[PDB]
Amino acid sequence: LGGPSVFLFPPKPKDTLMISRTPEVTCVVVDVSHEDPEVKFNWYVDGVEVHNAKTKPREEQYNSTYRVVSVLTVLHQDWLNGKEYKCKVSNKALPAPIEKTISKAKGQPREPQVYTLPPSREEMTKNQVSLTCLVKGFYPSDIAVEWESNGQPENNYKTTPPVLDSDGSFFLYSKLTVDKSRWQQGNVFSCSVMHEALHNHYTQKSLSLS
Amino acid sequence: APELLGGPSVFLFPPKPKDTLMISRTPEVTCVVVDVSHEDPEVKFNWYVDGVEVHNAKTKPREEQYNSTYRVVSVLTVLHQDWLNGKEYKCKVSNKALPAPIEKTISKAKGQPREPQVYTLPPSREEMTKNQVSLTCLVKGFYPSDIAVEWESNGQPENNYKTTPPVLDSDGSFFLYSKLTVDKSRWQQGNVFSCSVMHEALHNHYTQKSLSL
Amino acid sequence: LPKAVVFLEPQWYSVLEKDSVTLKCQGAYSPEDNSTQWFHNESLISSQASSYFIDAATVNDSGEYRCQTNLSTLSDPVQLEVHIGWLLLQAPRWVFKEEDPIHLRCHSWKNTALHKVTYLQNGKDRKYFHHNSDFHIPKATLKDSGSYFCRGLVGSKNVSSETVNIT
Numbered sequence A: 001l002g003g004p005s006v007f008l009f010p011p012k013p014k015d016t017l018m019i020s021r022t023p024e025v026t027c028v029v030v031d032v033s034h035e036d037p038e039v040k041f042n043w044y045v046d047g048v049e050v051h052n053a054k055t056k057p058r059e060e061q062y063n064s065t066y067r068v069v070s071v072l073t074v075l076h077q078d079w080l081n082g083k084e085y086k087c088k089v090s091n092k093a094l095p096a097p098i099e100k101t102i103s104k105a106k107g108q109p110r111e112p113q114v115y116t117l118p119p120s121r122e123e124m125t126k127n128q129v130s131l132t133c134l135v136k137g138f139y140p141s142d143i144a145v146e147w148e149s150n151g152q153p154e155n156n157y158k159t160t161p162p163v164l165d166s167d168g169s170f171f172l173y174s175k176l177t178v179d180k181s182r183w184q185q186g187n188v189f190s191c192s193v194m195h196e197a198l199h200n201h202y203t204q205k206s207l208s209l210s
Numbered sequence B: 001a002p003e004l005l006g007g008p009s010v011f012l013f014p015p016k017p018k019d020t021l022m023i024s025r026t027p028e029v030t031c032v033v034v035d036v037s038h039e040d041p042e043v044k045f046n047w048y049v050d051g052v053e054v055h056n057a058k059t060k061p062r063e064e065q066y067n068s069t070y071r072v073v074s075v076l077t078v079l080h081q082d083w084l085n086g087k088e089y090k091c092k093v094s095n096k097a098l099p100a101p102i103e104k105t106i107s108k109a110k111g112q113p114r115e116p117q118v119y120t121l122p123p124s125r126e127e128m129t130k131n132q133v134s135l136t137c138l139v140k141g142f143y144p145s146d147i148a149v150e151w152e153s154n155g156q157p158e159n160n161y162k163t164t165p166p167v168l169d170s171d172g173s174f175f176l177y178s179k180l181t182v183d184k185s186r187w188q189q190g191n192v193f194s195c196s197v198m199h200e201a202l203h204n205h206y207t208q209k210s211l212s213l
Numbered sequence C: 001l002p003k004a005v006v007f008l009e010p011q012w013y014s015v016l017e018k019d020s021v022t023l024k025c026q027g028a029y030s031p032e033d034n035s036t037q038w039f040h041n042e043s044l045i046s047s048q049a050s051s052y053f054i055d056a057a058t059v060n061d062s063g064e065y066r067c068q069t070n071l072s073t074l075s076d077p078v079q080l081e082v083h084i085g086w087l088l089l090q091a092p093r094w095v096f097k098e099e100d101p102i103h104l105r106c107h108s109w110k111n112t113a114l115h116k117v118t119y120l121q122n123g124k125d126r127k128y129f130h131h132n133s134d135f136h137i138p139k140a141t142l143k144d145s146g147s148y149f150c151r152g153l154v155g156s157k158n159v160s161s162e163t164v165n166i167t
């Protein structure tokens, strides 16, 4: 090999769900000499040239080398429908242009099932309490889960990364903590789940005592 | 074919947590070496237990081709206490196809060892609609990340289950969940199950908790 | 009687192992029996070759090399510095100052293919290269007082050269 390198990035998962968010696949080119800093980007969607579709570039200097960045905004549907996004970078010091395609995970998706699992008496000794919320049978792994406690974004709550199941789907927990008192003296919460399934790529499940 | 201009890399993997914790299990650390030169194979290793070599016994190759290049591995049966104590195991691969040898050194993570806490959680009512509920057991507040987990029902073990790897907890500790897939009935019919947790900070490197209705 | 003179081929005084070096003992010999004497650190060695050939350079082949003959006084000395590595920064001399383009070669063990090579001075990247290539300098300048060392990509793995002081 030897020459400029090219990396293609996809859009942020959450950006691809909230239509109010602007997705964008990014095509970075590194190892751009100071001798031939000319970088020609050509983008292609499902085979045809997107031309501009409003694609944007411009260069900067790091090591002692150059880095250019063209960026194509991805149309939600398109992206979600599995359209393939190709980026063709071609430098002068490049014997033949480099093509990089990226695309949303292939295969039919699956509606993530959410279940709130209250803490265990055995742990009702300690001062804090392990609230939990597993989500399983969803596909793909593109998911985010927060915790609305009082119309707020609670602090100390850890979530695990999805793990492949036997089906083909994935699952993941989300132990949310809270001082005993809180839950103790009867309070409520809910985990937020976002997948490319749910009515509006959104669903929430509540969990309190009783 | 595979051009290899470059020192066939080396990878060294630690031993399995259980094997380390069960005094009847032989934990072996392995030094895998890939990209071995067709025209320059077989390598000489060198294991340095915290300091000194250990040529004697503690050795085990057995070449084996692959993609289009060979692959040699060095197994080294450890010393439970040792390992579980901090012994830094070093491996040094030398192929006449490198300018010099490569030294990889792996050892048990350092930090105040922590005793876990296992809690078993019954599936959520809302899941009863399914033809398989999910017996879920947590495992919080422990360190290091090494640990094993299983499911005892009664006299004999389960398979249908998955576990997420440790996750650094907000308090420098660790944790995880292991979800069990049983059939609607099996659970409902009141059967009993046991989350089998193996870690170092255990009264006997073993604890438990049963889950029933 | 004149002194024999030892020359190097290639002209690189610092080299990697596996490299090939050749020490030639130029000069005149006696018409009656003309053997040459080579001296490694003022000591002999299989005495003959008008051109002692160091075929597979290793660390030990390092030291002061001198040569003599049936009609020459002990040659002046020549230093051969042999190192272990993937890369090596070469140059006739590191003590530079004026009117002379600083020639810096980044050499790779066994001459393997080196790419995306950088030339550094004080842990700072001074020059990048897509494919390995020597690092010269237009007009010598007093602003070249530092510590250099190159590094790049042999295949897909990184390699570096021991540091040096361009004085």
Ligand SMILES: *[C@H]1O[C@H](CO[C@H]2O[C@@H](C)[C@@H](O)[C@@H](O)[C@@H]2O)[C@@H](O[C@H]2O[C@H](CO)[C@@H](O[C@@H]3O[C@H](CO[C@H]4O[C@H](CO)[C@@H](O)[C@H](O)[C@@H]4O[C@@H]4O[C@H](CO)[C@@H](O)[C@H](O)[C@H]4NC(C)=O)[C@@H](O)[C@H](O[C@H]4O[C@H](CO)[C@@H](O)[C@H](O)[C@@H]4O[C@@H]4O[C@H](CO)[C@@H](O)[C@H](O)[C@H]4NC(C)=O)[C@@H]3O)[C@H](O)[C@H]2NC(C)=O)[C@H](O)[C@H]1NC(C)=O
Pocket: B002, B009, B011, B013, B014, B030, B032, B034, B035, B066, B067, B068, B069, B071
């Ligand atoms: C042809 O030959 C081989 C094999 O052929 C083909 O096989 C098929 C199946 C295909 O999947 C490919 O494997 C391959 O095409 C091929 O690959 C070999 O070289 C690559 C690198 O070039 C090796 O990659 C490394 O993989 C390890 C993990 O290895 C184990 O775990 C993986 C899990 O994905 C398994 O797939 C492996 O088989 C290994 O198995 C383990 O075996 C142990 C024995 O008991 C066991 O204990 C393990 O549990 C078990 N795992 C299983 C099965 O569960 C990674 O760890 C390496 O990553 C690190 O380096 C990369 C750089 O490449 C970094 O990006 C990354 O960050 C890692 O760096 C480490 O980061 C941590 C912090 O996170 C630091 O603490 C570490 O210090 C740091 N390490 C470093 C870099 O210093 C890496 O990906 C691959 O494993 C090799 N295969 C084999 C035989 O194992 C080979 O490339 C090909 N020839 C050619 C043309 O190149």
Ligand SMILES: *[C@H]1O[C@H](CO[C@H]2O[C@@H](C)[C@@H](O)[C@@H](O)[C@@H]2O)[C@@H](O[C@@H]2O[C@H](CO)[C@@H](O[C@@H]3O[C@H](CO[C@H]4O[C@H](CO)[C@@H](O)[C@H](O)[C@@H]4O[C@H]4O[C@H](CO)[C@@H](O[C@@H]5O[C@H](CO)[C@H](O)[C@H](O)[C@H]5O)[C@H](O)[C@H]4NC(C)=O)[C@@H](O)[C@H](O[C@@H]4O[C@H](CO)[C@@H](O)[C@H](O)[C@@H]4O)[C@@H]3O)[C@H](O)[C@H]2NC(C)=O)[C@H](O)[C@H]1NC(C)=O
Pocket: A005, A007, A009, A010, A011, A012, A023, A024, A025, A026, A028, A030, A031, A062, A063, A065, A067, C116, C118
């Ligand atoms: C000299 O310097 C160059 C610049 O590097 C500089 O990095 C910074 C951190 C400095 O501090 C210094 O480190 C240094 O000056 C070097 O360029 C680098 O080259 C190497 C290869 O030689 C590249 O490595 C591969 O990187 C990819 C991806 O990396 C991601 O993560 C790193 C983590 O830090 C980021 O640096 C990087 O930018 C990548 O992700 C991040 O950028 C994306 C694009 O901007 C973000 O995506 C966009 O995000 C937006 C909002 O943030 C928006 O949402 C948009 O929609 C979205 O597209 C992205 O979000 C962000 N982080 C993420 C991921 O979330 C790796 O995948 C790859 O890994 C493997 O590599 C092997 C072999 O290559 C391969 O087999 C595997 O298949 C993988 O590919 C490598 O790690 C590195 O990315 C380059 N850095 C830069 C500038 O991008 C240059 O090489 C140096 N010169 C030399 C050769 O000496």
